[PDB]
């Protein structure tokens, strides 16, 4: 049984030109790219993305830093929602484990390179917000017999 | 004092073509390749290899998954039996620490890329099972003065 | 709010020819190279560097291991003193976390590749010991807006 998570490379990942390195980390585990799209995030879509934080004082600056090119992604794998969060590491890079994306690439929470869904419910919500259903592609990885038990 | 451990790249490591990457992780610490052999594992030898698991429900599927090309290896280093196990990570890739082989490459325990000896006794037994003594090569690393205290 | 730490590649890092790999790990987080100098460490300066170990019985051997080429470095970043220590890993490579420098490259404490300042006071002392003020370079990283919140 596989699931799908929403992963988004933030404008700092684009501008520091580490998009390929990020994708490679997920491909390395045999996670399948089910969707991928470059767009420019706008305040209106970011308000819906960060709806849980509506009204808080840090949201305006969060929206400013996120207004920029982003890579929208959907990856598929076993337990991929929780596993992708583990691979990203703590929100605060200084607290993130060595070997995680945020520990390896970043210094502060406000520039922490990547977003990933925190639950099944948020993955469904975020994939619907950032993608049309035709953009989610169904295909099977040829190495499936050596990735899955 | 150094010791020797038995490490085996499983068929998923061969088929996903990450043999070199695996070897590089161990070379990176100054561990010495003492033996190396590509073979195709067969049920009879695998039954001896996994003798401790005799009777367990998962053994027949383990033997099936392991029937295939494997790279037999012996690496030498300080505390290398326990250290190689630490580098491999937990049996379940999803529980393994970021930066370990299983966390970085794998999803499920049944396809977790690599075997390593779990103790001094099992290392001795496994090395003798898969290698004849004439296959074990003794030489000194040129950088020994900078690897060992 | 950034600080500066003193990092030193030990003779084993020079001789194993992993200087560039070490530097890349720190550059990867957006840490700024503020100073860099190759020198051959002498017992006199090593005695002052390791003054906290004066009179102890392991000091003569530490100074001997360290008498050789070293790369003196100053890196700048948020919390970089503690963070560089985290990236280096425990003194004993066998105890260091996977994904740290010492865990990924080394076997024994006496050959553990790199030194880093362990506190604000030690960083100030060590930078001043190994560098004149004229050797510390002030410039701004062009990616600062994408590194710092
Ligand atoms: N005090 C805060 C709170 C959060 N953040 C930013 O806001 C994002 C959303 O906050 P949160 O959901 O708590 O962390 P993450 O889920 O890890 O962030 P994201 O959803 O974008 O992955 C964080 O990634 C972080 O960059 C911040 O800069 N300062
Ligand atoms: N419930 C289980 C138990 C184990 N395994 C498989 O059987 C192998 C041997 O089991 P075990 O010795 O308990 O784990 P490890 O020592 O981590 O595996 P290995 O000896 O091959 O290194 C595991 O690596 C794993 O591939 C499994 O698929 N399901
Ligand atoms: N019993 C000891 C004590 C220390 N060391 C060596 O002496 C250095 C300094 O010791 P210590 O300051 O206690 O460890 P670290 O701070 O991790 O080392 P460094 O200052 O060089 O970063 C260590 O890096 C290690 O190479 C050793 O070989 N064995
Ligand atoms: Mg979130
Ligand atoms: Mg075992
Ligand atoms: Mg110290």
From TrEMBL, chains A, B, C:
Keywords annotated in UniProt: ATP-binding, Kinase, Metal-binding, Nucleotide-binding, Transferase
Occurrences of domain Nucleoside diphosphate kinase-like (ranges): 2-138
Ligand binding (CTP 1): 10, 50, 53, 85, 91, 102, 109, 112, 115-116
InterPro entries, per the entry: NDK-like_dom (IPR034907), NDK-like_dom_sf (IPR036850), Nucleoside_diP_kinase (IPR001564)
Annotated residues for binding of Mg(2+): 115
Binding site for AMP: 10, 50, 53, 58, 115
An example molecular function term from Gene Ontology annotations: nucleotide binding
Cofactor or coenzyme needed: Mg(2+)
Residues binding ATP, per UniProt: 10, 53, 58, 85, 91, 102, 109, 112, 115-116, 149
Transmembrane segments: none
Entry annotated with the keyword Nucleotide-binding: yes
Xref: CDD domains: NDPk_I
Family classification: Belongs to the NDK family.
Protein name: nucleoside-diphosphate kinase
